[PDB]
Amino acid sequence: WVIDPSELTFVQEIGSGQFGLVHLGYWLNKDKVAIKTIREGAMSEEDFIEEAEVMMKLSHPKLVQLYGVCLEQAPICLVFEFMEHGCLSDYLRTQRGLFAAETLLGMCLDVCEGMAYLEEACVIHRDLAARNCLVGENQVIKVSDFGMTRFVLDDQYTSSTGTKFPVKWASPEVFSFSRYSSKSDVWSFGVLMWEVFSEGKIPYENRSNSEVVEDISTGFRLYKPRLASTHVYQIMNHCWRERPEDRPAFSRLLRQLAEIAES
Numbered sequence: 477w478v479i480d481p482s483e484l485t486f487v488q489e490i491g492s493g494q495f496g497l498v499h500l501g502y503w504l505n506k507d508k509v510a511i512k513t514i515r516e517g518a519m520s521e522e523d524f525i526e527e528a529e530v531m532m533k534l535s536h537p538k539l540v541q542l543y544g545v546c547l548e549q550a551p552i553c554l555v556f557e558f559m560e561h562g563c564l565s566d567y568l569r570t571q572r573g574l575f576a577a578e579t580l581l582g583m584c585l586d587v588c589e590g591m592a593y594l595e596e597a598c599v600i601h602r603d604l605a606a607r608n609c610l611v612g613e614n615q616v617i618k619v620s621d622f623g624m625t626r627f628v629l630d631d632q633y634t635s636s637t638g639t640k641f642p643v644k645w646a647s648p649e650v651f652s653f654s655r656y657s658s659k660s661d662v663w664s665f666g667v668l669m670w671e672v673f674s675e676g677k678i679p680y681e682n683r684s685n686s687e688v689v690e691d692i693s694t695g696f697r698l699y700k701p702r703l704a705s706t707h708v709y710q711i712m713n714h715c716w717r718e719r720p721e722d723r724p725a726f727s728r729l730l731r732q733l734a735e736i737a738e739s
């Protein structure tokens with residue numbers, strides 16, 4: 477799991493993150509990769525290093541793989557499977573008007589399959605959203621960054637009341653108590669479905685985080701996107717049930733969505 481600095485080459489930048497830059501590069505005797513450099517203080521590096529081998533075993537074709545860690549010198553680097561077409565959020569926004577509902581549903585099915593694998597492995601994503609779903613070969617969507625918020629040291633991102641907390645994708649028990657579970661990931665997956673079927677619109681765009689908490693708590697839900705059928709919107713609403721117990725498991729969503737896609 478440890479990669480030496482001599483085993484990596486940086487070719488060009490891919491883009492920035494809140495905690496570090498991502499580069500396109502090569503990994504010796506392996507493949508082209510994405511390399512993240514992490515600024516000092518952003519991550520609990522020791523916690524991550526303890527968990528790296530464990531994360532690397534979560535190998536599924538619909539999950540963006542962690543290949544290893546270059547830790548010889550600061551800044552430490554994380555090495556990932558390269559996803560050629562980038563973030564799903566920008567992929568949808570820059571191609572509005574192109575995709576048929578069958579293709580948008582297929583994108584949701586790829587994400588659901590990766591999430592069903594994590595759910596079976598008892599691994600919680602914690603921050604599922606279109607921004608961390610990545611587009612690869614043959615337009616496959618893969619989920620990235622599962623469990624990564626466990627290592628973020630900036631309390632503005634991790635505290636349910638933090639200014640950078642992803643309240644718009646959070647179930648009520650997460651925005652209230654940080655009570656994470658695969659059922660809270662299902663709520664986030666419903667928001668992700670809305671981002672996909674809306675072709676990358678921002679959910680609750682004109683609401684503050686405090687307003688989203690009050691709106692959700694009083695029964696408000698995102699409107700149906702034009703491209704979503706009434707059956708797809710019914711499934712979105714099941715993900716947004718107030719009680720986690722009433723939400724479908726990813727194993728149930730995968731069958732329900734596949735039934736629509738395969739019909």
Ligand SMILES: *CCC(=O)N1CCC[C@@H](n2nc(-c3cccc(C(=O)Nc4ccc(C(C)C)cc4)c3)c3c(N)ncnc32)C1
Pocket residue numbers: 490491492493495498510512514518519540554556557558559560561562563564565566610620621624625627628
């Ligand atoms: C929307 C533009 C776009 O395509 N983006 C944003 C810029 C970076 C692009 N990109 N990121 C990855 C990638 C994949 C998996 C994991 C990471 C990553 O750095 N995770 C991470 C999260 C949190 C922490 C903190 C400090 C604990 C540390 C690391 C990044 C890409 C891959 N694999 N391929 C292509 N582009 C990628 C996406």
